[PDB]
């Protein structure tokens, strides 16, 4: 249980750090970005999942 | 904090200062464009 909880929590932090830098760069980006609302939609939907996952796996570890 | 979240104790002691960095970030961006 803890095996999945901390992984999903550590990945949530790492993903966020990518999103924190990635999202504003992708927006202010002239060319190069049909490329990237996929990855915006990628991380976003994946971010919400991890939040719920860690939120659910919280009651099983504490 | 719960013992399961004792991992991010150094991270927690940093988070409150983050909003202030946004005020400083505005000056970086403005310096980057040369204060138009």
């Amino acid at each position: 249980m803890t095996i999945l909880f901390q992984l999903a929590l550590a990945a949530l932090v790492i993903l966020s750090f990518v999103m924190v830098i990635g999202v504003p760069v992708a927006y202010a980006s002239p060319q190069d970005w049909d490329r990237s609302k996929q990855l915006i939609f990628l991380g976003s939907g994946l971010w919400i999942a991890l939040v719920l996952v860690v939120g659910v796996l919280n009651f099983f570890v504490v | 904090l719960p013992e399961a979240y004792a991992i991010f104790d150094p991270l927690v002691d940093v988070l409150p200062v983050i909003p202030v960095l946004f005020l400083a970030l505005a000056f970086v961006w403005q310096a980057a464009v040369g204060f138009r």
């Binding site: 750090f17 830098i21 504003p24 202010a28 | 150094p10 002691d13 200062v17 946004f22 980057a32």
Partner: peptide, 29 residues
């Protein structure tokens, strides 16, 4: 103990890095 200092490092540089990336990419700054 200096994990302290590692957090403010990546977090603190996260801001200016975006500006640097948008500069070399010549983005909409």
């Amino acid at each position: 103990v200096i994990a302290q200092l590692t957090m403010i490092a990546m977090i603190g540089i996260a801001g200016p890095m975006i500006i640097f990336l948008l500069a070399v990419r010549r983005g909409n700054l």
